[PDB]
RNA sequence: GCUAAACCUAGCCCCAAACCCACUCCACCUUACUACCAGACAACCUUAGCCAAACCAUUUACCCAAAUAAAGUAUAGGCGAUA
RNA sequence: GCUACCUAAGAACAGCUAAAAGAGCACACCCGUCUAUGUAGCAAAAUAGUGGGAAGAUUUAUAGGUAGAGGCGACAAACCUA
RNA sequence: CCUCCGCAUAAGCCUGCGUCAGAUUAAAACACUGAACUGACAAUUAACAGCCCAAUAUCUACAAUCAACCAACAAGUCAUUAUUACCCUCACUGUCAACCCAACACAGGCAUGCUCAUAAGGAAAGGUUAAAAAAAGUAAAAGGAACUCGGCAAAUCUUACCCC
């Protein structure tokens, strides 16, 4: 059927999946945050 | 006080006392109709009901019967010329009800 | 998607997220088994307000007052105007003994008293 | 009483309140601590009344009678706080030889930067504090390349700034 | 993945315990076993497989009283709640066990074999040769791992100088120490073969997912194989 | 969405707001006695009330909880009003009903209830919706009372009225120049319940007397501590008005009366509202049930509540015996319990 | 053997310490000085304790150093104890003989026509209907709310007869009361601590039921024993306890003598509800405990045969089924099994009604059974009324 | 004659030189930007491939000592591309 | 956060015939047989009608798990953010 | 005239048709002045809901389905006790709207409770004319599948057989 509504928002899922703690919990996520800091992003995570 | 570190209270410890408070409040005109004993204040975020009651009865000697508080969300809708949202500050308002009539 | 730039406040999440976040007010007690909140009188900051009936000092100054050269107060100046006269007198009299500096205002440890200075026990 | 949130009713809507001379840091150092406390509360009440008047003027869509009074009061209380802080700092230096009455330590966080970590007055020791032992004050050196990249970015910005200063000076000399 | 096993409790108890399903997934979260998942919820009754275990501050053989015979969703055979002294426990009900019966759990091995009714547990040396037995161990005091399913039973074949020889339901023979405890008789819930599932829905309730629709061509394993019985299993250490 | 009205409330001047929401006038003191009938049989057996026996039973129920029982925990300063005074209250009510059965035969056939719920739902006034897609439309101000008295007494024969159905008082019902929300009151949408304390099939339709215990949030000491000294009787008055209006309204609507079919007879009820030690007594007369804007334009009837100041039953109970004991409070209790349905 | 602790869920032992801790005279250099973990170092920490007591984080001392710790274990019977061989277990633990029927005194009290309720059948039917259908706003009231309501309403219905018998004024119905009675029983220290619904307490003690002739003739009765199961099963064996044989009321209490103990089964769930035999055992032991506490209070702590027996009554109700009990205690010595035994007249399984339809059961738009109690036995309430009227006539 | 058109200077680039940064108060690894509580887990590891060899299968410059020269020499290599 | 499968703890299923029921008619609800319209459309798969199911191998809210040399799959080379 | 709607809660969103002024301009698919707006001012007040609990041992066989007879299987959604410790109290946060996911003021998608046609909530026609072609219906003489690959569609209610 119609397939534009793939985003079903929920703050719990958002913070659990892309949050600061989830980023820092893994060396790869720490490097994601470091890449954001190097590029100068205003928002390093969700 | 605000923007300060509170000493950690331990059971049996002394009374927490503030000597030069950092709280400033505004006496605002209500935007709606309120009971005759209701006074409306605009207080900082970190202030509480007990803080405002003690403030009123210690600095102005105003007898206070009740205090209620709420947080008003400032608008984050205005756009700058660069399309950057301008945020009006969220604030806290308090409704105090006078004591002795 | 979700607003990344707006500040995360207490109004934004689900029911559990609300009520956990807070707005920066400092706690004055704890929660018991029946969700009952116990307030501690000592955890509530008591306002120390003085008496102003006979206080002749207005929140402004007169323009007729004269200027003065500024001089920020230093530990050296405070020592010179606080302990130097007494210790000079009791050294000239020969009673000054270097071992006991306590009677000149000094104290060895700061744990004993109530308003300790380095960890800043008090509030403000 | 609640009438202390407003000035003298004769001044209501008078467009001017001729007063000034905010307190000077020297004049406040000239005073004692009890006088400083009482004057702090006097200034606090004056500031509250001025804030009330400013907000009411905003609501009524009228200019504030004399807005500089608020600035004078604010800077006077700032000077009083400066004087009290100076006396406290001198006393702490005299008795314990320390500044920064909030204990802390130079540490190095998970991103490899050098931070000044301020302490947080807990009630249990840190080795069994569970939440504290989840923060990581160390590098894990997959961050060293990012550290070098940030250093090089800083160097590029500084070089651009110096070169632009040189060019502006050259233009100024070229005309004059 | 955050997988914690439900089998986390260090004290024996009679009350049923909540058991979490798995879906055929190991601790890593990947499918380890296919065709498993999503049946009726169940609770776990703790079965005491060490049939001879005396109480605290008591040493010798003891008697017990079958309080009830109940259905267990976690196994093929039913389970008897049995009390004794001041404690009760669940055990595997054998055939013809009903409420009101008495069961003997004995340790002492005799010069001459003993006559055992269909519910007692004796060391395999004390039993007559040829008896039908179930819930057998391998080391003395290990606890019953072998025959435990519904209706299944094994037979004691011989007794040797210090060991005993037992035939398993798969007809494989094993020798265990003479002091290994086992219970007399066949396991209850016979006629379990004759159960007809009737529909795929009943399999789904039982908690088994359908087989993959991919067509696998048969290899060399598929033909019937006639092999001799495997050699004797021995659980007796010898220097 | 309806306003949830709480009889036991922390709102400051809730008595006047409840008077407005209910259309009730309040007067100090008991309603006047009915001296119109002439009891020509003044000389009779007339078994007199045993004041000594009633005082002994009251003091014994008091000592069975306050000075003494094989308690376990501490008992703590909080939950006192539940662990001590609630059993004291229902024990006292049960013993008094049992002892007064011979003097008041209507009590024997009564139904005694412990912490049963009573609900009344009604409409009073209107407002214009200020915001949203329904802005500018008129909406009714709906109210709901969910009460739970500690003890209740229900009878199958209605009591006698105190004043005539058209009884006029010169004082007028107070009015608010403000919204109900600022009491504070809060709105909610849930089931609308009209409940007398039991379903409609119960023969004991009418009410006799309610018994209310003030919660720990409304202690006399706490009210004094919060700089609310003249607020002590306000909680009593508000509890009485709300609870008795809810009870009488449920009683009336159980008979098929509502805003467009007001009443043919008044409805009456009584209430004893107490702290652990202080007691207050109230009588309520529901005259009108037509409180909507449509049905209140030309309506001169008012509901009436009569109330007394709170008096202490005892004073500083200590050393296994009660120091002071006001017998007048127990006399008021028994006099309330002695009311009977009027019989010709 | 099979052990029930899966090590994937057990605690993890700390990783082996660094080998620097094995070199004598060599002091390791760890991260304890920087007050935070670093991936190269490792510190030993002394056990921590508080110099101040905090009740929100208190830790009880180990059980053996508790002051009330006893080497020999006492066996506690409380309200939640469910005996396996219930009735026989209670009879053995209390050293009593059971009688099938209720005493003749209560039945003679209730057999007088003038002693009945004004409209007894209609009043009891109304009480059942109110407790089971009318009492709440919800369509079908639960047992947790309809059992105590029905019992309290039946008590008030019986209390209504005070005008016909002006001697019920010396009664009261006490809630939140407890009994605590400890007795030795074949070197088995037994204790009953009872806390139930409510107790009828009167200013005067109940007359004895059996005569001294029956008390003496009881001595030939032998208590039945169950071999494989100890009489002690399903009792809380505790090694920390105190021996206090007190009731809930000391001297000066105007209503010292218990009359009847009402035992409710407040449980919506059948597995949480007691079985009838277990409930009967519970009331037998509670009545025995009340009688024993009274006996110790009045006649000292001696173990002797009582010349003045102690009578305690009880009734246990599921909300629909009732069980009645009259217990007479004659002895305070219970270690030996040969003397005179106490008596217990117990009446079991008395329905007040068979079923209640809260809604009209409809089969093809025609009602077959109406809303109300199906089946009704007035004899159950007659026994109830007799038990209430035992003390006063 | 409308739409439009036009404009210098913000800044940037490549070099040279020089080794460069970071706590006012408060908050921020939990759902970061959250005043306040009892399991203390923890990092260290040979790139691969595109492509070239006119396919591809061994192989195919790329690594951190100022230059220059020896020298594209000696050598290596499906002795061939190339190194 | 779609979807495939699973885990934990929830919710929904009128009325009639009730044979007892992975039974029948039939709502809500799930799906999508056939036709017509639409085809830069309301819609990067919809609308109207008509249909299959609708107490079960059902539908469904919430949180969690499995990931690309892989996962998951009542094998359609299905699905894993159009 | 329509209503297959609506009112709440959850989730989501975050001031997004409240007042005043500018309306000369600007988005209104046109306009008045207000859903496709600019600036200022003002508001959501806890009882509802979140935010919980001192240890150490110990206890916890008997489903639910009006739970009563009866009847099962797929075998189930709810409980303590013993001892020690503990006498301070009502803080903080959500509370608005015509609203969310679909690039849109999108015929799509969206959990639960409540009345199941309403006391909620709404408007298919900018004006005119009465061509063709096209779409959706309604009615149709006589005939009644002769249509067509095929009874597709529509209208009526329908018998028997075969393959898988
Ligand atoms: Mg197969
Ligand atoms: Mg196949
Ligand atoms: Mg090539
Ligand atoms: Mg080429
Ligand atoms: Mg090729
Ligand atoms: Mg079906
Ligand atoms: Mg169907
Ligand atoms: Mg195929
Ligand atoms: Mg294919
Ligand atoms: Mg709202
Ligand atoms: Mg779209
Ligand atoms: Mg309308
Ligand atoms: Mg239109
Ligand atoms: Mg037209
Ligand atoms: Mg047109
Ligand atoms: Mg035709
Ligand atoms: Mg043809
Ligand atoms: Mg043709
Ligand atoms: Mg067709």
From Swiss-Prot, chain B:
Signal peptide: none annotated. GO terms for cellular component: fibrillar center; mitochondrial inner membrane; mitochondrial large ribosomal subunit; mitochondrion. Belongs to the universal ribosomal protein uL23 family. One of its GO terms (biological process) is mitochondrial translation. One of its GO terms (molecular function) is RNA binding. Component of the mitochondrial large ribosomal subunit (mt-LSU). Mature mammalian 55S mitochondrial ribosomes consist of a small (28S) and a large (39S) subunit. The 28S small subunit contains a 12S ribosomal RNA (12S mt-rRNA) and 30 different proteins. The 39S large subunit contains a 16S rRNA (16S mt-rRNA), a copy of mitochondrial valine transfer RNA (mt-tRNA(Val)), which plays an integral structural role, and 52 different proteins. It comes from the Eukaryota. Keywords: Mitochondrion, Ribonucleoprotein, Ribosomal protein. It is found in: Mitochondrion. This is Large ribosomal subunit protein uL23m. It comes from Homo sapiens. Its main location: mitochondrion.
UniProtKB/Swiss-Prot annotation, chain D:
Belongs to the universal ribosomal protein uL29 family. Component of the mitochondrial large ribosomal subunit (mt-LSU). Mature mammalian 55S mitochondrial ribosomes consist of a small (28S) and a large (39S) subunit. The 28S small subunit contains a 12S ribosomal RNA (12S mt-rRNA) and 30 different proteins. The 39S large subunit contains a 16S rRNA (16S mt-rRNA), a copy of mitochondrial valine transfer RNA (mt-tRNA(Val)), which plays an integral structural role, and 52 different proteins. The keyword Acetylation applies. The gene is MRPL47. GO terms for biological process: mitochondrial translation. This is Large ribosomal subunit protein uL29m. One of its GO terms (cellular component) is mitochondrial inner membrane. GO terms for molecular function: structural constituent of ribosome. It comes from Homo sapiens (Human). Keywords: Acetylation, Mitochondrion, Ribonucleoprotein, Ribosomal protein, Transit peptide.
Curated annotation (Swiss-Prot), chain E:
The keyword Ribonucleoprotein applies. Belongs to the universal ribosomal protein uL2 family. Component of the mitochondrial large ribosomal subunit (mt-LSU). Mature mammalian 55S mitochondrial ribosomes consist of a small (28S) and a large (39S) subunit. The 28S small subunit contains a 12S ribosomal RNA (12S mt-rRNA) and 30 different proteins. The 39S large subunit contains a 16S rRNA (16S mt-rRNA), a copy of mitochondrial valine transfer RNA (mt-tRNA(Val)), which plays an integral structural role, and 52 different proteins. The keyword Nucleotide-binding does not apply. GO terms for cellular component: mitochondrial inner membrane; mitochondrial large ribosomal subunit; mitochondrion; nucleoplasm. Keywords: Mitochondrion, Ribonucleoprotein, Ribosomal protein, Transit peptide. Residues 204-223 are annotated as: Disordered. It comes from the Eukaryota. This is Large ribosomal subunit protein uL2m. Residues 214-223 have a biased composition (Basic residues). The chain holds residues 61 to 299 of 305 of the full protein. The gene is MRPL2. One of its GO terms (biological process) is mitochondrial translation. It is found in: Mitochondrion. GO terms for molecular function: RNA binding; structural constituent of ribosome.
From Swiss-Prot, chain F:
GO terms for biological process: apoptotic process; mitochondrial translation. This is Large ribosomal subunit protein mL65. Belongs to the mitochondrion-specific ribosomal protein mL65 family. Keywords: Mitochondrion, Ribonucleoprotein, Ribosomal protein. It is found in: Mitochondrion. One of its GO terms (cellular component) is mitochondrion. Component of the mitochondrial large ribosomal subunit (mt-LSU). Mature mammalian 55S mitochondrial ribosomes consist of a small (28S) and a large (39S) subunit. The 28S small subunit contains a 12S ribosomal RNA (12S mt-rRNA) and 30 different proteins. The 39S large subunit contains a 16S rRNA (16S mt-rRNA), a copy of mitochondrial valine transfer RNA (mt-tRNA(Val)), which plays an integral structural role, and 52 different proteins. mL65 forms a heterodimer with mL37. The gene is MRPS30. Heart, skeletal muscle, kidney and liver. Lower expression in placenta and peripheral blood leukocytes. GO terms for molecular function: RNA binding; structural constituent of ribosome. Coiled coil: none annotated. The chain holds residues 89 to 432 of 439 of the full protein. Disulfide bonds: none annotated. The keyword Protein biosynthesis does not apply.
């Amino acid at each position: 059927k119609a397939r534009g509504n793939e985003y079903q928002p929920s703050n719990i899922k958002r913070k659990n999946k892309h949050g600061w703690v989830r980023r820092l919990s893994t060396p790869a996520g720490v490097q994601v945050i470091l890449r954001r800091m190097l590029k100068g992003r205003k928002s390093l995570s969700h | 006080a605000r923007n300060v570190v509170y000493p950690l209270y331990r059971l049996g410890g002394p009374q927490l006392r503030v000597f030069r408070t950092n709280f400033f409040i505004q006496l605002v005109r209500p935007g709606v109709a309120q009971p005759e004993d209701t006074v409306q204040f605009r207080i900082p975020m970190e202030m509480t009901r007990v803080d405002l009651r003690n403030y009123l009865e210690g600095i102005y000697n105003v007898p206070v019967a009740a205090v209620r508080t709420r947080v008003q969300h400032g608008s984050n809708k205005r756009r700058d010329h660069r399309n950057v949202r301008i945020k009006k500050p969220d604030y806290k308002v308090a409704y105090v009800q006078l004591a002795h009539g | 998607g979700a607003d990344r730039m707006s500040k995360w406040t207490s109004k934004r999440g689900p029911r559990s997220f609300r009520g956990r976040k807070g707005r920066g007010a400092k706690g004055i007690g704890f929660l018991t088994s029946g969700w009952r909140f116990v307030q501690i009188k000592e955890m509530v900051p008591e306002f120390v307000v003085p008496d102003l009936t006979g206080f002749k000092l207005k929140p402004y100054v007169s323009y007729l007052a004269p200027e003065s050269e500024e001089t920020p107060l230093t530990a050296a100046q405070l020592f010179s105007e606080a302990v130097a006269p007494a210790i000079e007198k009791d050294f000239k009299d020969g009673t000054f003994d270097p071992d006991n500096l306590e009677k000149y205002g000094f104290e060895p440890t700061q744990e004993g008293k109530l308003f300790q200075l380095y960890p800043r026990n008090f509030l403000r | 009483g609640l009438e202390e949130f407003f000035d003298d009713p004769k001044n209501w809507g008078q467009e001017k309140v001729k007063s000034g001379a905010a307190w000077t840091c020297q004049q406040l150092r000239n005073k004692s601590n009890e006088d400083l406390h009482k004057l702090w509360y006097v200034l606090l009440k004056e500031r509250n009344m001025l804030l009330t008047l400013e907000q009411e003027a905003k609501r009524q869509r009228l200019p504030m009678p004399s807005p500089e009074r608020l600035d004078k009061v604010v800077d006077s209380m700032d000077a009083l706080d400066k004087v009290v802080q100076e006396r406290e700092d001198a006393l702490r230096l005299l008795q314990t030889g320390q500044e920064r009455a909030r204990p802390g330590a130079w540490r190095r966080d998970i991103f490899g930067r050098i931070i000044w970590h301020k302490f947080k007055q807990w009630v249990i020791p840190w080795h069994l504090n569970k939440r504290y032992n989840r923060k990581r004050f160390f590098a894990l050196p997959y961050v060293d390349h990012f550290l070098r990249l940030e250093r090089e970015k800083r160097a590029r910005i500084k070089a651009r700034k110096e070169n632009l200063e040189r060019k502006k000076a050259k233009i100024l000399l070229k005309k004059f | 993945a955050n997988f914690v096993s439900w089998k986390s409790r260090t004290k024996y108890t009679i009350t049923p315990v909540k058991m979490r399903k798995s879906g055929g997934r190991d601790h890593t979260g990947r499918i380890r076993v296919h065709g498993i998942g999503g049946g009726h919820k169940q609770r776990y009754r703790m079965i005491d497989f060490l049939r001879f275990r005396p109480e605290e501050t008591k040493s010798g053989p003891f008697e017990e009283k079958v309080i009830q015979v109940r259905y267990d969703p976690c196994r093929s055979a039913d389970i008897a709640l049995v009390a004794g002294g001041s404690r009760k426990r669940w055990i595997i009900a054998t055939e013809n066990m009903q409420a009101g019966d008495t069961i003997l759990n004995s340790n002492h091995i005799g010069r001459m074999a003993v006559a055992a009714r269909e519910g007692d547990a004796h060391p395999l040396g004390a039993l007559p040769v040829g008896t039908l037995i179930n819930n057998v161990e391998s080391e003395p005091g290990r606890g019953a791992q072998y025959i435990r399913a519904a209706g299944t039973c094994g037979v004691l074949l011989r007794k040797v100088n210090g060991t005993a020889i037992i035939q398993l339901p798969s007809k494989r023979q094993m020798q265990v120490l003479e002091t290994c405890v086992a219970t007399v008789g066949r396991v209850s819930n016979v006629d379990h073969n004759k159960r007809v599932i009737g529909k795929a829905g009943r399999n789904r309730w039982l908690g088994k997912r359908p087989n993959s629709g991919r067509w696998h061509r048969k290899g060399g394993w598929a033909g019937r194989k006639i092999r001799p019985l495997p050699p004797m299993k021995s659980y007796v250490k010898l220097p | 969405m309806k306003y949830m009205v709480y009889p036991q409330t922390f709102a400051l001047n809730a008595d006047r707001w409840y008077q407005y929401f209910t259309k009730t006038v309040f007067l100090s003191g008991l309603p006047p006695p009915p001296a119109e009938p002439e009891p020509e049989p003044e000389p009779e057996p007339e078994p007199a009330l045993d004041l000594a026996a009633l005082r002994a039973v009251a003091c014994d129920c008091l000592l069975q909880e306050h000075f003494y029982l094989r308690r376990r925990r501490r008992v703590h300063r909080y939950e006192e009003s539940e662990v001590i005074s609630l059993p004291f209250l229902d024990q006292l009510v049960s013993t008094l009903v049992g002892l007064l059965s011979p003097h008041n035969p209507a009590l024997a056939a009564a139904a005694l209830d412990y912490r049963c719920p009573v609900h009344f739902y009604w409409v009073r006034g209107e407002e214009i919706i200020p915001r949203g897609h329904r802005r500018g439309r008129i909406d009714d101000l709906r109210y709901q009372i969910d009460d739970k008295p500690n003890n209740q007494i229900r009878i199958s024969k209605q009591l006698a009225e105190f004043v005539p159905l058209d009884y006029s008082v010169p004082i007028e019902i107070p009015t608010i120049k403000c919204k109900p929300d600022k009491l504070p009151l809060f709105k909610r949408q849930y089931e609308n319940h009209i409940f007398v304390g039991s379903k409609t099939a119960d023969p004991c339709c009418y009410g006799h007397t309610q018994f209310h215990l003030l919660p720990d949030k409304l202690r006399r000491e706490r009210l004094l501590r919060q700089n609310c000294a003249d607020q002590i009787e306000v909680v009593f008055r508000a509890n009485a008005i709300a609870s008795l209006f809810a009870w009488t309204g449920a009683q009336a609507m159980y008979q098929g009366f509502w805003s467009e079919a007001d009443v043919t007879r008044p409805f009456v009820s009584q209430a004893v509202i107490t702290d652990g030690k202080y007691f207050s007594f109230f009588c309520y007369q529901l005259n009108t049930l037509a409180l909507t804007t449509q049905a209140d334009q030309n309506n001169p009837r008012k509901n009436i509540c009569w109330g007394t100041q709170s008096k202490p039953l005892y004073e500083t109970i200590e050393d296994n015996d009660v120091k002071g004991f006001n017998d007048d409070v127990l006399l008021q209790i028994v006099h309330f319990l002695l009311n009977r349905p009027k019989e010709e | 053997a099979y052990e029930w602790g899966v090590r994937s869920t057990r605690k993890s032992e700390p990783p082996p310490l660094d080998r620097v801790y094995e070199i004598p005279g060599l002091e390791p250099i760890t991260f304890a000085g920087k007050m935070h973990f670093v991936p190269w170092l490792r510190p030993i920490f002394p056990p921590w304790d508080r110099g101040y007591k905090d009740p929100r984080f208190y830790r009880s001392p180990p059980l053996h150093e508790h002051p009330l710790y006893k080497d020999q274990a006492c066996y506690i019977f409380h309200h939640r104890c469910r005996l396996l061989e219930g009735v026989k277990q209670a009879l053995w633990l209390t050293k009593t003989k059971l009688i099938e029927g209720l005493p003749e005194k209560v039945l003679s009290l209730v057999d007088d026509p003038r002693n009945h309720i004004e409209n007894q059948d209609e009043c009891v039917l109304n009480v059942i209907s109110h407790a089971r259908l009318w009492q709440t706003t919800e369509e079908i009231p639960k047992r947790e709310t309809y059992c105590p309501v029905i019992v309290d309403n039946l008590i008030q219905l019986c209390k209504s007869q005070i005008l016909k018998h002006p001697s019920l004024a010396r009664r009261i119905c006490v809630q939140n009361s407890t009994f605590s009675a400890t007795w030795n029983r074949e070197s088995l220290l037994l204790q009953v601590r009872g806390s139930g619904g409510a107790r009828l307490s009167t200013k005067d003690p109940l007359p004895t039921i059996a005569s001294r002739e029956e008390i003496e003739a009881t001595k030939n009765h032998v208590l039945e024993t169950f071999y494989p199961i100890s009489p002690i099963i399903d009792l809380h064996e505790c090694n920390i306890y105190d021996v206090k044989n007190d009731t809930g009321f000391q001297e000066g209490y105007p209503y010292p003598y218990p009359h009847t103990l009402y035992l409710l089964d407040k449980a919506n769930l059948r597995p949480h509800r007691l079985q009838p035999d277990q409930l009967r055992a519970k009331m037998i032991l509670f009545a025995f405990g009340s009688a024993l506490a009274q006996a110790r209070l009045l006649y000292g702590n001696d173990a002797k045969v009582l010349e003045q027996p102690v009578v305690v009554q009880s009734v246990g109700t599921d909300g629909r089924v009732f069980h009645f009990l009259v217990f007479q205690l004659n002895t305070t010595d219970l270690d030996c099994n040969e003397g005179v035994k106490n008596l217990a007249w117990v009446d079991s399984d008395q329905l007040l009604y068979q079923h209640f339809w809260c809604l009209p059961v409809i089969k093809k738009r025609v009602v077959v059974e109406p809303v109300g109690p199906v089946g009704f036995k007035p004899e159950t309430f007659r026994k109830f009324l007799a038990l209430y009227l035992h003390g006063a006539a």
